């Protein structure tokens, strides 16, 4: 339950595949209107691997229907990404998600 | 046992190294520096009210040494229990004597 | 009854006694051999006697009729000052009936089970008595001597408040007479504020060997004040005041004249009880049962200094009371910043939570993360 | 609303000003796992972005310093700090070149201290491991809840030194608002951090050539601005200068152990090689005198330490030298000893140039011209020039905690010095179900390094039996049995010391010392399996021979008064399960019996002493006893094991320990008669030749009478057959107790032996 | 140091040693000036505070006791580990007394403090008026020069059937002899100036 809309155009034909990197210099943000995370603030691209389940799967299937060099913008069903409990300390239990997700290279 | 006793030329060296150190204790231990004992209460309290001061009224600025008894006395009148180890009061207690 | 100890209650209000001699002039004289004369106990305000069966029964001041008392000092086995002759801690003086004419001595029958339990013997007037009384006397007349004569007249002045109080515990006013008997109102509020001046902590800009004198003689007194009860009775006056709810008016089926003077009542004895709770660690111990209680009201619309600061007070010296916590008065306390406002006392309570006199405790020290910090508001 | 303005409030600031400090309470010593949770509350930009601010309202922002210095660090000082005592040094090449600055050209033999702090100094120290913060991770379900959060450094250390070269250029040009508002929130939080970053030592070479420029005119210059140290300042900040010059000493201190080491490696290498040389002239070769032999006796007797002594006495000595050595290889002492005593603070008969000449002509001044309140500071510089004035007392604390190791085992101690950290860290927290589990693997881990069966002198030095020793302690405070929260720790970590104790001699008595402590709480707590505190005690001496002489009775009169409890009480604990519990309990009292016979003997019937006040104390409380014998009522010398035989086969009976009851009461009474046969007199060396011990020799046999044991031995169970029997009855493999008993009392004479 | 002693009520560490030690130093030969000082702050302060310590911390001086000795006469009959750099303690001395070095200091703290026939020690220390208890010092010490007395008598009967005194019987020997001498010295300085 991923919904995607795109928010500036990008290549549009060279989409991420498996065993391949990806950095995402991205931002994030609650349903509220309150952000609790970033990566801009830290001056750092977040760099992850597809394939090995090491970021939450709603983030992964949301980044896998988008090209180089795209903007967009995601929304995670809370049922996808921390269902019950949630990530102690950070998100409240059962809140939908909000994500500000753009990639810089590597496909 | 005695008798089995190791030569010494078969130690390995990190070994024969640690031995040196603790029994090499015959050169600071029988040494005696004196020193600080007679030039440390003259420099310190006795002169410590130099040209410094300016002016005064009534009463005198404690001397360095007068700040240091007090704050025994001060740390003595503690509500407590027992007294805590403080190494430190032994290290002048014994240089005043 | 009558016991001895050890080195125990040697530092307690409890083995202190008052020698009452028979005369009315001249009574402070010189105490010499061969006198007769009373004892009364000074916290209890009672005299010792003998009456026909019970044994050494420390019986009332009504029933003291100069023979059930009548006791005097012996060896062995005048309008002025008078002789001085028994002397402190070496007069060795011995203890005798005068009507009887039988001396005092230790009965001493202990059993297996007494041996290796209770350290306590029952003390009788037997006929021809032991060979080790050598009953010497010890003076103690100094400011802890003047805060004894004050549990006896507090502690006969609030039980009689609770008591009279209690009557009407579940009885609606039949408009018009009130009640029976009637109850103090002012003798109460001058007395609890006497106390509370009286154990008002040491100040600010006096010196350390001053400070330091006096920090020792508050200790010893707010010790002093919870080994003769009243910690119950002033717990046990808020049990009984705190049935009334709302304001003076569900309290009106007690006497309305007496219903404009609620609020101050019920604040005065909250801030008394910081003062026996406030600086002393053996005291703080004994809230551990009684954790919850206190807990439990936070919420009271005119209670707000008086229990913030009791329970500021007793989490800042035992760290035993913090280990007894488990997930819902974190909440309470959280739920009282969001009725009650930006308090930054509250905030502070918190800290209190947290490390303590230089250990730290994990257990708790999420919940106050994951409840009051998740939710942005 | 903008935070600049929250200046003016001072009502919304003092909200904000402890909300701060929860965040500080919060993150208590050690707690990664909420510590990241506030990284995405508070920030990780703005704080950063806080420090160049300069508008600031005081107990506002100048508290965020005490921010950044928690969810970032000390999570390694709190550490390291606890590293800097010990010096291990490793044998490597660049140890082997270190010297008093032997670029010196003359007079920089007698000068040129060297700037305090340069590099080069092979110590082994754990290095910093951090983590990045990343919320759209996986759900995890390894570290300790987690390693560690990330930031950083190379940015911090280059913003931090220039923004105090602002700070001592301001405060020079003088202003009627200084930063924060007053003079020392522009001091004490901004070096707070300098100082905290110096421990762990980010700073390299360069960086510290520069923070020594900021008293330029004295330490710097080796080959307008004025000092740190010529202006007035506030009662704080001079604390924190007070932090910062402390650190400078042990650096000294830490160079000054590592040149003797040096020393310490080229010495010894010729003394080894000499003394070969030595050898060959008196060797086989020889020649003659017959008593020279008899002078050449180091060289093949005596233990290698006491060899050392004596080749080393005369080297240092004065005057007199016995046994001597070439006068080659006696002239570098000589001359390092000289060197050494030339360095410290020996005369050997303006411009301070030298560390010890500032420090000592500073504190003084500071004491002169003012009168010094908040005793927290005056405590901190008496600390100092007392270590300035006092160099040789100083090092002759610090080499009791110095060793060398030898290479290709450098890892493997980096591992355990490592993992023992976190031992340091538990002893701090309250005792937690998670970290409990944490110490177990750690612990675990030690015991397997390949370290910790070679070095033990290390573990003496490192001392964590001490630091564990508390562990045990606090977990088993309580006011009763029921206060027996976090089982299975005790058992698992009390193991971990019996095989200490099994390792050297020294290692005995190093925790012997501790026994009256050991035994003050140990017979509180019984009940469980594999170990327990009395195990150890028991372990602390079992073959020494000389602690066994070195007991001091009041530590066997204590445990002796133990037992008198377990001849009265009756095990609520075992009454819980719904058990008779009639008169007393054997478990408890075979526990304590089994400690006392490791004190009477130690190598083969020996040490009577303390075996002699045994006996006579033990009579003096008769219900040591158990009752069925002994006493008023009965005795039951063949019926009381016949009447357990009886509720031996009697399951309904017993308890409707973990097997039976009558094993139990077997196991008793066996274990005494066991403690009162090797608590024997004396062999008869002492007893046919005296008549002392023949007093003792009385006294127990007239407790034992010999128609009865002698009809003991009989009666076995059964064999096994068609089935073997349960070790839950009353056996007779602990039946070889009334044999010793026997044996070394009454003895075999007449022809009685055939009966 | 008067300060410092009566915070320490009853156990003899290292606390009171270093600072008994120090007061030998200030109040040596007989300085009346200090003495005086001394005098006026206990009449000041008015509480016991101190003399509870004195009497308890003497009574828990050692003497010659003679179980400890048989202790060491067996342990010094081994030599040297089977190998670890012998015995490493050597004299090991910490036994029959431990304490000549310190509690020989004690009674020469008493001592000193009633020297020039100072006429309100010597009656200060018997009683103290005011307060609220008495300890009477004198009568407090000669009990330890009878227990120290019934102690080297014992000693005695050990070698009553010998015929010569070995070495080791002598060195502990003159331990406690030097110690009596030195109590001795004390109770004249009370009734020296009558």
Known sequence: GVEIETISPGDGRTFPKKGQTCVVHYTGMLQNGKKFDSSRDRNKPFKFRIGKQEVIKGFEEGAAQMSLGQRAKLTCTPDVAYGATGHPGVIPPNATLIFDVELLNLE | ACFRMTPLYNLPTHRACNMFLESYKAAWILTEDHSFEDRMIDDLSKAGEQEEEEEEVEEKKPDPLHQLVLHFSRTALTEKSKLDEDYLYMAYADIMA | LVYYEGGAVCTHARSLWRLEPL????????????????????????????????????????????????????????????????????????????????????????????????????????????????????????????????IHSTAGLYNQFIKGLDSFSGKPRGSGPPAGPALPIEAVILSLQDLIGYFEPPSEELQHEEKQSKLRSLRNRQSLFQEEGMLSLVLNCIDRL???????????????????????????????????????????????????????????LEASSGILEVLYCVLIESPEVLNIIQENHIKSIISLLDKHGRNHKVLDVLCSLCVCNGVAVRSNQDLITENLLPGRE | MDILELSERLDLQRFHSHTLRLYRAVCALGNNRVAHALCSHVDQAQLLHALEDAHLPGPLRAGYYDLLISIHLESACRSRRSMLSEYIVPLTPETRAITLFPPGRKGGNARRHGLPGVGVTTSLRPPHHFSPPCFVAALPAEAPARLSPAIPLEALRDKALRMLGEAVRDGGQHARDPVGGSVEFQFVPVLKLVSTLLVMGIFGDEDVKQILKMIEPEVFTEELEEGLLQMKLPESVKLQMCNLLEYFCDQELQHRVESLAAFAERYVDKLQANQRSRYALLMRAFTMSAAETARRTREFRSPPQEQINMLLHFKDEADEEDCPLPEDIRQDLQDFHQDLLAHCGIQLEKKPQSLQELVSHMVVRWAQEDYVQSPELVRAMFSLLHRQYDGLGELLRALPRAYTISPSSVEDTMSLLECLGQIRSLLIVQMGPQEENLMIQSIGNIMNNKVFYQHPNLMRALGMH???????????????????????????????????????????????????????????????????????????????????????????????????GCGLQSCPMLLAKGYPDIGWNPCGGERYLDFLRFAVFVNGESVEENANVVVRLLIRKPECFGPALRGEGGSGLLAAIEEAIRISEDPARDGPNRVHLGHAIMSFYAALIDLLGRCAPEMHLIQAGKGEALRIRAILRSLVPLDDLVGIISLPLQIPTLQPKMSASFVPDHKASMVLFLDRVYGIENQDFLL | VLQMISACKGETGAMVSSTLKLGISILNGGNAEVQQKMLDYLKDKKEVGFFQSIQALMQTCSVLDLNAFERQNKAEGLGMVNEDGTVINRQNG???????????????????????????????????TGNTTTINIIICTVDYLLRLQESISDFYWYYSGKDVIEEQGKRNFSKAMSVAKQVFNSLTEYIQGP
């Open chain 5, 94 to 128: 910490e036994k029959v007394m431990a304490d000549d070095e310190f509690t020989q200091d004690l009674f020469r703290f008493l001592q000193l403090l009633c020297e020039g026939h100072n006429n309100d020690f010597q009656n200060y220390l018997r009683t103290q």
């Open chain 3, 23 to 150: 005369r009315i002039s001249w009574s402070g004289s010189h105490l010499r051999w061969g006198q007769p004369l009373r004892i009364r106990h000074v916290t209890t305000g009672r005299y010792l006697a003998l009456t026909e069966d019970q044994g050494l029964v420390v019986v009332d001041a009504c029933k003291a009729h100069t023979k059930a008392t009548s006791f005097c000092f012996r060896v062995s086995k005048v309008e002025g000052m008078g002789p001085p002759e028994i002397k402190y801690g070496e007069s060795l003086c011995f203890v005798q009936h005068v009507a009887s004419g039988l001396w005092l001595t230790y009965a001493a029958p202990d059993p297996k089970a007494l041996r290796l339990g209770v350290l306590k013997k029952k003390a009788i007037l037997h006929q021809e008595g032991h060979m080790d009384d050598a009953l010497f006397l010890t003076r103690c007349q100094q400011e802890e001597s003047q805060a004894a004569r004050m």
């Open chain 3, 242 to 300: 705190n049935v009334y709810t709302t304001a003076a008016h569900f309290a009106e089926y007690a006497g309305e004249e007496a219903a404009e003077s609620w609020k101050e009542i019920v604040n005065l004895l909250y801030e008394l009880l910081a003062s026996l709770i406030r600086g002393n660690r053996a005291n703080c111990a004994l809230f551990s049962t009684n954790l919850d209680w206190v807990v439990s009201k936070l919420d009271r």
């Open chain 4, 466 to 564: 001490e630091t564990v020793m508390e562990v045990m302690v606090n977990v088993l405070g309580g006011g009763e049995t029921k206060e027996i929260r976090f089982p299975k720790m005790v058992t698992s970590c009390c193991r971990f010391l019996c095989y200490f104790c099994r390792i050297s001699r020294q290692n005995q008595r190093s925790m012997f010392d501790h026994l009256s402590y050991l035994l003050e709480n140990s017979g509180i707590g019984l009940g469980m399996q594999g170990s327990t505190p009395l195990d150890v005690a028991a372990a602390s001496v079992i073959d020494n021979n000389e602690l066994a002489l070195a007991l001091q009775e009041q530590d066997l009169e204590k445990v002796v008064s133990y037992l008198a």
